[PDB]
Amino acid sequence: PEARSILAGAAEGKVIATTEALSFWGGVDPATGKVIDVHHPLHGICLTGGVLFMPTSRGACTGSGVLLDLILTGRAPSALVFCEAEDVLTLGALVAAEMFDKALPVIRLDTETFARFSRAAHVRIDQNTIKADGVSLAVAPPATAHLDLTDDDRAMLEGRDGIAVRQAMRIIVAMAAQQGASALVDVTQGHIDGCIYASPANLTFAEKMADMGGKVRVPSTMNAISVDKANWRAQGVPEDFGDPAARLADAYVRMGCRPTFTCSPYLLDSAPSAGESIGWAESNAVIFANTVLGARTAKHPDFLDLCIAMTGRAPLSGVYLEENRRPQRIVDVALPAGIDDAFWPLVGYLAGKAVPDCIPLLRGLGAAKPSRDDLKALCAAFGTTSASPMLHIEGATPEAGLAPLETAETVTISLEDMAAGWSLLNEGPEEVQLVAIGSPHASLEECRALAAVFNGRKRHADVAVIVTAGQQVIDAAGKDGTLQSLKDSGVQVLPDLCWCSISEPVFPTKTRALMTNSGKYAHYGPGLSGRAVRFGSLADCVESALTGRAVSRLPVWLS
Ligand SMILES: O=C(O)[C@H]1NCC[C@H]1O
Ligand code: FES
């Protein structure tokens, strides 16, 4: 029996337990504290005041901002209890303690005690004990850092570079300690993800850092934001939402971040190369950078991305170290005939469910030669159901030859698993009023593939077709004629926004059901939008747009 203090504090309340990880962004509504992940066992439960037992987190880096807002409003759970390593929620609780004077206790239990305490009705937490229904267990004090700090590190910690840089280093050093790191590491560039207006606290944190003089030290790009920056007012986004959403993006631009406003920064000319140590947030971008590009970055939670960008330093832990990039589980993936584009996001989705807390190696798929866009959609879906910052695909990704860990077990993803996943992501009617493409932001190749399927035809007037992409890709599609061909088919191409941050009336209010080819938005979409969401191929979506209807059936490779 072992209880370990991760973050100190005292709490008490009803046990809310689960064996499946939850992403607080997209899975918890900051307005109510209710679970909105329609595929999670806790869907509908309000977590406010409860003691949340779950093995670890999964999915989005933005959970840190959602949790912080929940702590600032009083709708957060009273405590968090894990049984494995965790970063996103712990970081959000650590920011709350460091900068907002709010303590949320976070405890990690051994797996046996986690299950035992999961069945309890009530839990109390104090700084020395955890008791579940009349059995008190001692809580070991937090791990204190065996951290090496350079002279420049200690100068930053001391305030030599101002208070903003100091607060940034304090958070980095606290994170390195809880990750058991023995040093920090230089990063060459950043990618900020907390620029999505996921909660009022996302703005509050950014304006606090910016008001202390925060500024980035390495070149740093920006993820998707919550307004079409140049057009949201003409678009009719309410001033109560669009004004803080625009000020959030403005705060990071003030701090020196490049206004790329895209969740596919690996498509930019500034994309990192193999072996390069970067510090990125946004789950799909982190996984793509490690998996496909071979660059190196942990899955940094929101807020921590800014601190890393401000100091040029990240904790030397996780996938920054070569040994931690070795496969930790083997997944034999069935290879049916007649694969189309929808295969790869489904495979990523199911791989995350099967491997939610370690780095898998997908075997059996190399000869299918997935495209860069296939791998992009795969990593995005994998970054929905798993916490891992990277994966490997045998015969496809550049590090797939690394020796698996001596402890790697072998599991499979069957055709039966795929048929189950397909129906799961297809809980909706056949009528649709919207086709949603571009989560993560569409590449130029994807915009060209979409145009090819449309084949010069125009969408049914009943079915809006919206593509979200980065500004640089839209500019490139404007120059090669792809953009005009899409507008000729009635397709609206939006910059800056993504499906994770879109809102009404840019998201058309008349929508009742939408179809998407994104495994990621298929999962998050129902709880984010309130609409029904269908998942399908690129051509499934286009046929939906041309006819007005998306037929409910398993695809060719599933027959
Ligand atoms: O890391 C993630 O997955 C989240 N960042 C912003 C939106 C969502 O993608
Ligand atoms: S912001 Fe979540 S994938 Fe675009």
Author numbering: 11 to 569
The publication says:
Aconitase superfamily members catalyze the homologous isomerization of specific substrates by sequential dehydration and hydration and contain a [4Fe-4S] cluster. However, monomeric and heterodimeric types of function unknown aconitase X (AcnX) have recently been characterized as a cis-3-hydroxy-L-proline dehydratase (AcnXType-I) and mevalonate 5-phosphate dehydratase (AcnXType-II), respectively. We herein elucidated the crystal structures of AcnXType-I from Agrobacterium tumefaciens (AtAcnX) and AcnXType-II from Thermococcus kodakarensis (TkAcnX) without a ligand and in complex with substrates. AtAcnX and TkAcnX contained the [2Fe-2S] and [3Fe-4S] clusters, respectively, conforming to UV and EPR spectroscopy analyses.
Ser70 in AtAcnX may be sequentially homologous to Ser642 in mAcn, which functions as a general base; the purified S70A mutant is almost inactive and brown in color, similar to the wild-type enzyme. Therefore, to obtain a more-detailed understanding of substrate binding, we elucidated the crystal structure of the S70A mutant of AtAcnX in complex with C3LHyp at a resolution of 2.0 Å using a co-crystallizing method; this structure had a similar conformation to that of the wild-type enzyme in the apo-form, with an r.m.s.d. value of 0.4 Å for 559 Cα atoms. This mutant enzyme had the same [2Fe-2S] cluster as the wild-type enzyme, and additional electron density around the [2Fe-2S] cluster was clearly modeled as C3LHyp. The carboxyl group of bound C3LHyp formed hydrogen bond(s) and/or salt bridge(s) with a water molecule (Wat16), the side chains of Ser293 and Lys530, and the main chain nitrogen atoms of Cys71 and Ser293. The nitrogen atom of C3LHyp made a hydrogen bond and/or salt bridge with the side chains of Thr72 and Asp203, respectively. The C3-OH group interacted with the Fe1 atom and side chains of Glu292 and Lys530. The hydrophobic side chains of Trp35 and Ile206 interacted with the C4-C5 backbone of the pyrrolidine ring of C3LHyp, which may explain the extremely poor utilization of 2,3-cis-3,4-cis-3,4-dihydroxy-l-proline (C3LHyp with the additional hydroxyl group on C4) as a substrate. Ser70 was clearly the first candidate as a general base because when the structure of the apo-form of the wild type was superimposed onto that of the holo-form of the S70A mutant, the side chain of Ser70 was close to C2 of C3LHyp (a distance of 2.7 Å). Therefore, we propose that the dehydration reaction begins by the abstraction of a proton from C2 of C3LHyp by the alkoxide form of the Ser70 side chain, similar to mAcn (Ser642). The Fe2 atom, which exists in the [2Fe-2S] cluster in the Fe3+ oxidation state, acts as a Lewis acid that accepts the electron pair from the leaving hydroxyl group on C3.
